Each structure stands twice: as C-alpha cells, then as structure tokens.
C-alpha cells in the first residue's frame, strides 16, 4: 500500500475491463492536498485514445491498485445520449521527476540535502514522506538507512529549491 515513488515509473497501466492503456512516465504531485493528482502515460493505446500529445494525464481517483500493473476504472467507453421518441439510444501542479535529486533547504536557509525519493500511499494517494540524501546535520528530522525523513506535513514549497520546516 505504502511505498516509494519511484515505483510507477515504467508500469504498464492497464483497465479493470483488462485493456491496456500505457506505460507511466510521470507522477503529477500537489503540495496543497498532499496528494498525487494524475498520472503522465506514455505509449499509450492509440485504439482507446484520440489525442495527438506526446503523452496524457489520468487522474489519480481512477486508480484501483498498484501491484505490478496498474489497474485503472474502464473510462474509454462512449455513453449515449438519450431520445424522447426512441426507446434506443443514440451514439456520435509539479511533475515528481522534475524534483529529481533538488536539494532540500530549511526556513533560515540550511543546506538540508539532496532529494532521494518521495513515500506515497498507493490506495489513498497521499504524500507522506521526502527521502533527503543528507548534506548538513540538522537534530529536526529523524533518520532511517541513512536519509532524512521530512513529513510531508512540513513542506511548504516545491520551486526552485524543495523548502522545508521544523513543523
């Protein structure tokens, strides 16, 4: 359920009718919900897809499971619209890996590191962890196989350089 982001890259995303839909290539991030947004595809299946863009973006809420695979709900359907005198039917934000290894900064203007990886919640979608390859010393963030473990609560923006508080 929980693991790293660097997990989606190169899945192949298929339906739950088993249709395969592509291969992500990018993870789209919120700060503000703390949460995954979409998914960039690329490779994406031509017989399901009329688009022209080197790649699309699903949103996140209609991910079912991250396994080996990517289970999406079957959206590529067409619905028909309904006729009074016929009972038929008729028928006619920041990408995660431009975050790539920036480097990680505090409130006064500390060096933190550079990021390693980002823990997200499969299921739920939410952003729970940065993963900070350590330059400076700071006491705030605790430490596991050698990075720092930033909350994602303490984040509080994500241009140029990743900034990050204390609480």
Known sequence: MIGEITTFFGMRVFTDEGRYVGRVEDVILDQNTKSIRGLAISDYNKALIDSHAKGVIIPYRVVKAVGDIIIIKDLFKRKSRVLD????????????????????????????????????????????????????????????????????????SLKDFIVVDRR
């Open 85 to 156: 005198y016929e009972s038929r039917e008729l028928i006619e934000y920041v990408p995660a890996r431009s975050l790539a290894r920036k480097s990680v900064v505090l409130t006064d203007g500390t060096v933190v590191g550079t990021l390693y990886n980002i823990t997200v919640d499969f299921k739920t979608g939410t952003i729970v962890n940065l993963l900070v390859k350590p330059e400076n010393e700071i006491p705030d963030f605790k430490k596991e196989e050698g990075l720092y473990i930033i909350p994602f609560e303490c984040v509080r």
